[PDB]
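#dry-run=false #mode=assembly
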Amino acid sequence: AVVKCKPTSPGRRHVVKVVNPELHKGKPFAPLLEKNSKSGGRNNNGRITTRHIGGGHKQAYRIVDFKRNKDGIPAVVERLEYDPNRSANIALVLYKDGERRYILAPKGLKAGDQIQSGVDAAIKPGNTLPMRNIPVGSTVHNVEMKPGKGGQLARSAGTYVQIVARDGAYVTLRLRSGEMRKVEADCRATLGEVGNAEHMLRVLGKAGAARWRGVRPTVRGTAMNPVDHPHGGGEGRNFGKHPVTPWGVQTKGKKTRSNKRTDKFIVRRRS
Amino acid sequence: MKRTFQPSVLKRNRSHGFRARMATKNGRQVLARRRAKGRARLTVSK
RNA sequence: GCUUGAGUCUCGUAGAGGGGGGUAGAAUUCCAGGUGUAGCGGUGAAAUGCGUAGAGAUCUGGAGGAAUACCGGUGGCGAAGGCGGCCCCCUGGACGAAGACUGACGCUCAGGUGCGAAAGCGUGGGGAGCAAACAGGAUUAGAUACCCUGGUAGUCCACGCC
RNA sequence: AGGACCGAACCGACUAAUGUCGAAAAAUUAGCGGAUGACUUGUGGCUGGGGGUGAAAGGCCAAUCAAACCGGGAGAUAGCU
RNA sequence: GCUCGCCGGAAGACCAAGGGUUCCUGUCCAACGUUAAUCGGGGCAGGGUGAGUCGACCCCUAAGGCGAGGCCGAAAGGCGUAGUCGAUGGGAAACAGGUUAAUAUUCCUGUACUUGGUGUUACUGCGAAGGGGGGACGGAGAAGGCUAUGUUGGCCGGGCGACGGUUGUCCCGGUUUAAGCGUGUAGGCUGGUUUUCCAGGCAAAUCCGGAAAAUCAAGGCUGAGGCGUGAUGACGAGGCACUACGGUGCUGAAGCAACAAAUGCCCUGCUUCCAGGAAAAGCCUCUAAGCAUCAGGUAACAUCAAAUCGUACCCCAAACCGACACAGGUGGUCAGGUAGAGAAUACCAAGGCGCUUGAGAGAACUCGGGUGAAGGAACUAGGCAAAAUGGUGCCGUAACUUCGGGAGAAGGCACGCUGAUAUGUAGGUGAGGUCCCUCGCGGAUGGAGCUGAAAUCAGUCGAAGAUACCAGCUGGCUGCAACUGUUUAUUAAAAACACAGCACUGUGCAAACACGAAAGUGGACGUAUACGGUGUGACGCCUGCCCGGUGCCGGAAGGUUAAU
RNA sequence: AAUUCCUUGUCGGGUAAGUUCCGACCUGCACGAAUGGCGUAAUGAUGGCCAGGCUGUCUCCACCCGAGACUCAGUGAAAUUGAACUCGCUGUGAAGAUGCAGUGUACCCGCGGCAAGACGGAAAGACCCCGUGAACCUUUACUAUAGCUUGACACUGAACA
RNA sequence: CUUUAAUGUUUGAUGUUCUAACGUUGACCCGUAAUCCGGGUUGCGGACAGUGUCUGGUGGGUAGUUUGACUGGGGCGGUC
RNA sequence: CGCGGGGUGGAGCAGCCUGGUAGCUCGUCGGGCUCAUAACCCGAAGGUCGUCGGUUCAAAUCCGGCCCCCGCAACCA
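#status=ok
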């Protein structure tokens, strides 16, 4: 939910923290957790491949099953957990044969309800089945790109993909950006959009609220020196240039879509 | 003032050690020249 | 205490009364393909715009958003504002019928509180049409007006404010 | 609860003075600022010379940086002293 | 040796790091020490480091490195899989006294404990590179109960004191005791047990998990300290005894209570919020492949083994690092008496030192400080520097505002000591006694003793009672930037930068982009409420006109147009 | 005005006195709306101005207390330096003289002091200029180039319409 | 010679279909307790993609250099 | 000091470059439209081409001097 913090201090007078009183304050499931070390921009070569990433807090990796391959098994929800690695919360689920597994939680998913996968499940937010057994126009998420991969699109908070039309072994989708993409019909999806829709309303407030988060301060080029950044220069904020990236390629208007092997799947570009 | 040499036995041998040199070709290029001058102290070791 | 006050209970009636969730066709705009040709659009006249890269026109398909022809009436409901394509669920008020029942529980009401079209504002989405501001072209002594070609905010929606 | 307040250890270094062949190749003295956080700090690694790093000064990379140090091109070249 | 002075949350006592005999002793003084030197971290010779329980090695693992094959690349080489290393992490086991010129949780005395080999006996099914559990964890805040430790009292030993008093409400000193074992508390956590079934855990499972039932209401687990024991033992003030006059031998009383009280312990807890807080192994436990009169497992007892290496000394400094015996820097533990909020500060205990040039003079001048008539910024670039304000409780507090603040705004009053309320109060702790009990480390009840604010009234000393150290200058106008924060290490700490926020634009995932000849990684084990770039930079009111020049994007018909 | 050259513009306020400061007037050399505009509580080792309080900063310093300076003994440097029997003045001169000329004056030599000179000592000027010097950086300076992008050829083929 | 109609033939520009090349950072099994890799079935695209060669365009991201002299000092202006 | 540009009817501006002929709007005079003015329609005049000389067949024009005005420069220590 949305709750404005009282203006007691400079740095707190703009903090709006999300209150979700349904998340279990207990300890997250041990077997479903393994470590994920930080790297912060570093890579194989040890260079800072990507800027503004590092520091931050320590967070353990959660195993979220996107495949959901188990068929014909009702799933009794156990509880709603909080998730550091994802903006979307995860719901601890218990299957009928006694196995604990995590799933991305849809909108109306309370502690204890039931969901099921396979093509035997009716329409309830949380059900999983191929889109060649879905009503044309259904709001879904966690859709996959290849038949059996697991899921690539519509996974963030309040994300939903609208199925436009269906022609044979190809489903005319409408991704969140609005870019019409024809994906193979043999791909499993999950009904109902992801809840947690007040995530957008969250406003940090403190610079430290971003520091322990994992971000790193971004320095403008207008302040740097020409030897380090293409903008810099001048004794008094001079510009006179076409805004380009730290590596010469022009920005603020420069399409870089050169795939060729996936051009056939884009009906209309995002707009 | 923290002078530019805070001693450490362990770090010295992990970056200037004998066997540390026998790692790469460049390292064996070092001892080639070290033995070339007939220097008694091949590398900082024990 | 008794009833001609008021209110309640039993049965029905009409209704754009309100809230939420779905649904339909006509029409307009946009895109792609086929047919096809020099104008189209517009006005008091004209021009900008649009078009020989082939529009407009016509036909087919598809994606969108808003409003609901005819029925519609100085008709109906509601305190007022205001509310109309259809359907489901939840639900308010008024009216009539023949009786019973409690026994004046009534009326109004500074302050207070609540509702409240449009315009406007904030946060998050939507964006077809219309259209402040602005722009070009005319008219004109001047036109930062009336006309015409476009067009952002807004107009729509959920939650709040005024 | 708080990038909250006063204030030691701690970290840093704004003012003044001493010092400048100094006690010291940036410190002492008397006051300062932060002091539960974007904090400080030990041990142990990774990134490297037209490259690294950078809350961006062209500052930092072993007292040396608008391009480190060492060896070799090289006794480079010098219409200059 | 006797006084004085100094530090004392250090200038103390020990470890890690890092040096490498600087430690101890004898002898010597040329060289070393900014002076002499019989002195010494200097020269010369000799001695000293004793471990199953400390550390490391070792079992295991992270960041990250190497890396059989392998992918890729002129070669070198780069990367990476299984593996294998790598602690600052986790994992078995000892405490006390004595002893040396120097070393000791290592030697000795006394008393315990851990991990394996082997053998015997009584029983029984054991058994992996595989499963599950456990290990196993964040920050902050509050609280209960103890301990370290300290003061007072009781008791014990000594004294009764060179100037007036001191046999008593007097003075000084001591009043120490662990690991383990046993009971198993304060407190905390979780509902136990039995039966059946099962698409679950790469196979399998009696282990775990799920789903149905039955019985009863507890059981189990975790857990400082105390009490006993360890210990009719050690130590022990002070004497008794020999002096190489340094020390050694012998002997030896009291050894309890109460209160206060940690940041140590319970706590690797509990509550709460969010940014959501290692892995593996040891341990425990279950099976596959199989082996079964076995091998092995469990329990007791006996014996054997516990190796290798470091161990000296310094360790906030003359021994490390700064060329020096250098006013510098260096992580961690313990850390007492009084006042005091405190680890501040002042003075002291333990303990360790007077800093390796002194003796005179007291000139100008210089550095560090004190005080100063009348005036009070008249100084000067400028209130720079000094001065002054400075504690606690309470009285009281404006413009403006985002209604949190501003604010400790400003400005003031009372603070010592003694007595009385009250042979020291409220409050806190809490023995004895009494009763009961599913009987113990229990609960009510009861209140001695002890410890001990503050408030009110009165009296009295001084000029001054927060009397010392210590300890805010404030108000008014206003530019700029929001703010805490960051930077030119070594002349610039700011209005420069960062900042949450806002905006635009790029990107449909083998994503954009970046490193890299490539592979492969980062992005992200994330995916449009996401990520990269750029610009501005809290919030509030707002963000107008121009598409000529330039760039980007869209449409491609025509003219021009390379290779072929 | 962090911007106004002219200029200390003009009016009003604060002072006895105000090139600063504060509030306005618009003649804006040359403010202006995300290279964001105008305001803004709080914060600030920030900038400028003012008052109270309090003081040696000042009128003008005076004294006292410690460590040096000073004397004695011990130990014992450094920067620099062609050579010196190393005076002032006037003039002259590679153009500001201790040294040449003229003249005056002055016993030889120490210690403590003070800094006008010896264009004192230190840095083969950092200012200016030169060199057909270097180094970085800028772009619609010239020529190349990574990257990106375009088409053809090859890996790469069969079909009908 | 121009306009032209059919057929044979010759290359070329598009469209769609197809699967063997090839891509496959999809699933499954094995080597194998190994998220690398290799291979085998299968699935999805598809003669594209990607790469080598040649070539046009862009290109201060990057590299090597140029950027005149005389001049009552240089600069500006002017001049040769 | 130096460089560049301009001066044309009453006003505001073309024309120059590539020498002979001067244009547009407003304004003024006069007429009409209306009761009247403005506006509108119609007609016409008005320019020493800043200033003087020179070159040339010919000067607004090309060059030079001078005057006025505008912009730039008026510098690095």
